[PDB]
Design an enzyme around this catalytic site. Structure first.
Site, PDB file in Angstrom:
ATOM      1  N   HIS B  64       0.874  -1.205   0.086  1.00 19.02           N
ATOM      2  CA  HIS B  64       0.021  -0.076  -0.098  1.00 19.02           C
ATOM      3  C   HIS B  64       1.099   1.351  -0.048  1.00 19.02           C
ATOM      4  O   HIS B  64       2.033   1.244   0.620  1.00 19.02           O
ATOM      5  CB  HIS B  64      -0.992   0.008   1.215  1.00 19.02           C
ATOM      6  CG  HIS B  64      -0.491   0.192   2.475  1.00 19.02           C
ATOM      7  ND1 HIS B  64      -0.201   1.217   3.260  1.00 19.02           N
ATOM      8  CD2 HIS B  64      -0.106  -0.739   3.496  1.00 19.02           C
ATOM      9  CE1 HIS B  64       0.476   1.136   4.310  1.00 19.02           C
ATOM     10  NE2 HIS B  64       0.438  -0.231   4.535  1.00 19.02           N
ATOM     11  N   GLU B 212      -5.036   1.252   2.689  1.00 19.73           N
ATOM     12  CA  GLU B 212      -4.868   0.298   3.692  1.00 19.73           C
ATOM     13  C   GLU B 212      -5.044   0.659   5.119  1.00 19.73           C
ATOM     14  O   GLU B 212      -5.596   0.311   5.887  1.00 19.73           O
ATOM     15  CB  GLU B 212      -3.652  -0.256   3.340  1.00 19.73           C
ATOM     16  CG  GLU B 212      -3.263  -1.667   4.287  1.00 19.73           C
ATOM     17  CD  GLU B 212      -2.869  -1.490   5.705  1.00 19.73           C
ATOM     18  OE1 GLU B 212      -2.887  -2.133   6.466  1.00 19.73           O
ATOM     19  OE2 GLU B 212      -1.998  -0.548   6.030  1.00 19.73           O
ATOM     20  N   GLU B 213      -4.489   2.012   5.579  1.00 19.30           N
ATOM     21  CA  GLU B 213      -4.541   2.469   6.866  1.00 19.30           C
ATOM     22  C   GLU B 213      -5.744   2.561   7.355  1.00 19.30           C
ATOM     23  O   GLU B 213      -5.957   3.116   8.527  1.00 19.30           O
ATOM     24  CB  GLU B 213      -3.542   3.639   6.903  1.00 19.30           C
ATOM     25  CG  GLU B 213      -1.938   3.299   6.615  1.00 19.30           C
ATOM     26  CD  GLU B 213      -0.925   2.552   7.478  1.00 19.30           C
ATOM     27  OE1 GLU B 213       0.051   2.485   7.543  1.00 19.30           O
ATOM     28  OE2 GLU B 213      -1.725   1.906   8.351  1.00 19.30           O
TER      29      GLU B 213
HETATM   30 CO   LIG Z   1       0.784  -1.120   6.376  1.00 18.48          CO
HETATM   31 CO   LIG Z   2       0.239   0.859   8.622  1.00 19.53          CO
END
Ligand SMILES: [Co+2]
Ligand SMILES: [Co+2]
Ligand SMILES: [Co+2]
Ligand SMILES: [Co+2]
Ligand SMILES: [Co+2]
Ligand SMILES: [Co+2]
Lengths: 358, 356, 357
Positions: B64, B212-213
């Protein structure tokens, strides 16, 4: 260009390495800038340098701004290659974690990061706890005690924040570290420079002093005061600027609304005639001036005003946001006005006026 | 040569918090123009680079490119910004830190700040400052002076953190390693395979996922696009090199890439896990068995795509992730690249069907 | 008449029985109102109904407003004739005690009151304690387990707040329950109606969807998104209105126009689409409040993740006291939300939409 040379000095000062006890690099910068402007240079044995602009033997005006910055010192190397440290000067622990620092070893500058144990390897009830500075360390990218030693690190090595200098807000606001109190040193140096450059006469001798070890107990001020035997003192410092939302009375000063004048602090109650003098000089010269009070802090003045039989003193300040931290902000306009103000004061501080304060 | 390090530097210094990854993914597209056979995207902003071979199996590698960051939530009457976090941050690493906000007028610098402790009651100074009570100081003196800089509610914010290398060229220092270093690996793997004409019995989808985070969002949608038969997710591992223990953070910086044997978002396919362990042993690449008790990865979504997809997470141990500045080993990174190439070489249709 | 028929719809919706999982009565009302205005009606198997206004095959615009309301469900009958209940959707316990509810049994509507043990029969240190919802029950006026059963109550029976609809402040402000998110459904239905009535052309096909089960996990949104395969989504929701005497935590004010959500826990909006809405609103002179919901989500959380992704944005009507028996919202804000959505749909052609990605 002088405006260039001034900004280049500012940059160099705020970017220089010089925590309490280790101010030699910064004071060297000051000596070099002032070679062509000071009539003489005297020092104390702690490392304070003082620049004299000659005039009448008496009265002696002492202007002081400390060139030491808050910092750290290496207290050990752990078996895994991390450094423990002690603080040099007052730090709030909550501004430390995750911050870049640089350590000066015999082999040169070594970069690192202030770190702690990560919260996910702690018990749930210990994650909500503030991490104390005693439990922090500096990570320099080493993987063993030996790899750390190879970088040159020794117990007792000095450490400063890593913080580049720049200007923001369309040239109006300076950003960087060590404004406390290199901006004060900047002001007194620029005042002396300008007085010589424009042949401004002053009925007195001016001692412009770049003191050491303020942040650990006003140490250089005591010894510099001894050397100078001043008749009146103008201490230049920063003021904690209360521009942050939430009250007003605990931090009166605002960045951009002019230099401050300290009417009371924990280390000194100013001479009242001298206080009134500064207020009037400023009003007459149309220099905005903010009345300030530092309930829980002190200044070089705390020691200077107690020299020998006493010395009338006042603190004049540049409002600065986020002092004693990696990065702070101050107004270049406020700074300019502080320089203007100090010149006007020096012009008018003759023997008669000064004896009238006591 | 310079080109790899110039890429690394540019990535770690790029602006790209969750939801606003376009500048970073542009950098990825540009670097990969001469090396990818084709480029596909998802509508969230993930870009994916295809290196062609056999139609099947499809190998998905994902890293990511979003970084933890912040977003402007208001301008106060005094010229300060309030913010919300984008991704998981520990409040104790925030105060005093430099950030930069991207406005319509360009980059605006600022500092994370709070009320100073000497203006608080004595019993409130020992209290942690919560992120809800912080703001960003951009040097403004009024709501208007702040507006003049271009700031609007909803504007993205990232940490300010230059990239450099320390420890005599061994250790990289900067932000956003999580997970641009993973993206860096997959890009370098694909580049090298083309440059050295390394054949692979499969089609490789190297994907620079987004968001993603904030909930593995780009992974879900990229998995839909690709329909992968096996997945190698590249991530960072929290490195337990810090004094005080071992079992909670098994990996050490410099002791090789990690292989995740369990995490909150996925239990890896066991045949595939054994495969990686053996490939690494045979290739003499050091490999650290790891476990992330309380964290997840893009794999959490990828392995659940359609009827399932065997997946495994491979990691570079990194110190101080989800903070302004972290450290990782260039040697570990190199070995992760080596490892992934060896895996791709050997992932033919028969081996992959043997995992299920 | 149309202004009557609109207000009559609003009233009927806000007064209808339809907690999460049991939305059929409310979605029936929607189908009936829309019979003469939708070109076609598709459903998901959870109970979401979706109304299609035809135009170009692509792009497909999905507008969604959930018709489920927060409510409760009967968890037991005590030996003394009281009901225990579980919550359906997020409730703050402090707004529950003393409130009227109605339970739908096989025998019809049964009225009751949320109650607890009275504080004077508790120890002094337990009276200052908040009463948790687990320790509450519903009093239906019964004096025994049998008398309760006679009313028709069974475990699993649905419960809603009792809250009549009216208008106050000289016709300006609506008062009642279930604004979240029947007002959103009201907007999308009125938009579609008006587009047909005034022959407003739109370079796209519009799917106006009355989703189910938002308040318990965005469930109907996921399945409706699957059915529709949308190219862009406009989710209509309520915004928590910060008019009560922390500006930054609740930016929106009732009466200052619809809101546009710039960030929420379930989604960061597509940025081109966000800018598009801001401009369309400015150009149409429709007031628009930039908003942020730090700790809440929307149907968009699932819709924007459908298949390969779908650019989406949340548009809101500021509402006071949501997830409670009685809330307030501005009819003016509502009207402007309808106006805004029409202007957006007019301009969302295939080229503009592909330009968002
Ligand atoms: Co990550
Ligand atoms: Co992360
Ligand atoms: Co100082
Ligand atoms: Co100080
Ligand atoms: Co809702
Ligand atoms: Co709701």
């Amino acid at each position: 260009s002088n405006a260039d040379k001034s900004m280049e000095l500012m940059k160099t000062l705020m970017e220089a390495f010089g925590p309490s006890g280790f101010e030699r690099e910064v004071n060297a910068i000051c000596k070099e800038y002032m070679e062509p402007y000071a009539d003489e240079v005297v020092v104390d044995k702690l490392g304070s340098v003082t620049f004299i602009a000659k005039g009448n033997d008496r009265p002696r005006i002492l202007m002081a701004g400390h060139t030491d910055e808050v910092g750290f010192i290496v207290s050990s190397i752990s078996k895994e290659g991390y450094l423990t440290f002690n603080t040099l000067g007052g730090w709030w622990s909550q501004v430390l974690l995750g911050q870049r620092v640089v350590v000066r070893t015999c082999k040169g500058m070594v970069h690192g990061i202030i770190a702690s144990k990560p919260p996910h390897i702690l018990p749930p009830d210990e994650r909500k706890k503030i991490v104390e500075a005693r439990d922090m360390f500096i990570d320099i990218g080493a993987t063993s005690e030996e790899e750390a030693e190879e970088s040159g690190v020794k117990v007792g090595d000095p450490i400063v924040p890593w913080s580049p200098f720049s200007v923001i807000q369309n040239g109006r606001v300076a950003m960087g570290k060590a404004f406390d109190d290199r901006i004060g040193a900047f002001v007194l140096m620029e005042a002396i420079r300008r007085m010589k450059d424009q042949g401004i006469e002053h009925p007195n001798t001016v001692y412009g002093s770049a003191t050491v070890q303020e942040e650990v107990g006003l140490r250089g001020a005591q010894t510099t005061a001894h050397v100078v035997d001043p008749d009146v003192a103008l201490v230049l410092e920063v003021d904690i600027a209360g521009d942050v939302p939430g009250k007003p009375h605990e931090a009166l000063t605002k960045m951009g609304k002019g230099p401050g004048l300290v009417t009371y602090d924990r280390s000194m109650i100013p001479n009242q005639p001298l206080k009134e003098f500064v207020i009037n000089v400023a009003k007459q010269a149309q220099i905005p001036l903010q009345l300030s009070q530092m309930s829980g802090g002190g200044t070089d003045a705390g020691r200077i005003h107690m020299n020998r039989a006493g010395c009338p003193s006042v603190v004049i300040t540049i409002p600065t946001r986020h002092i004693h931290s990696h990065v702070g902000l101050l107004s270049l306009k406020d700074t300019e006005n502080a320089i203007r103000l100090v010149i006007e004061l020096i012009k008018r501080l003759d023997l008669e006026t000064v004896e009238g304060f006591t």
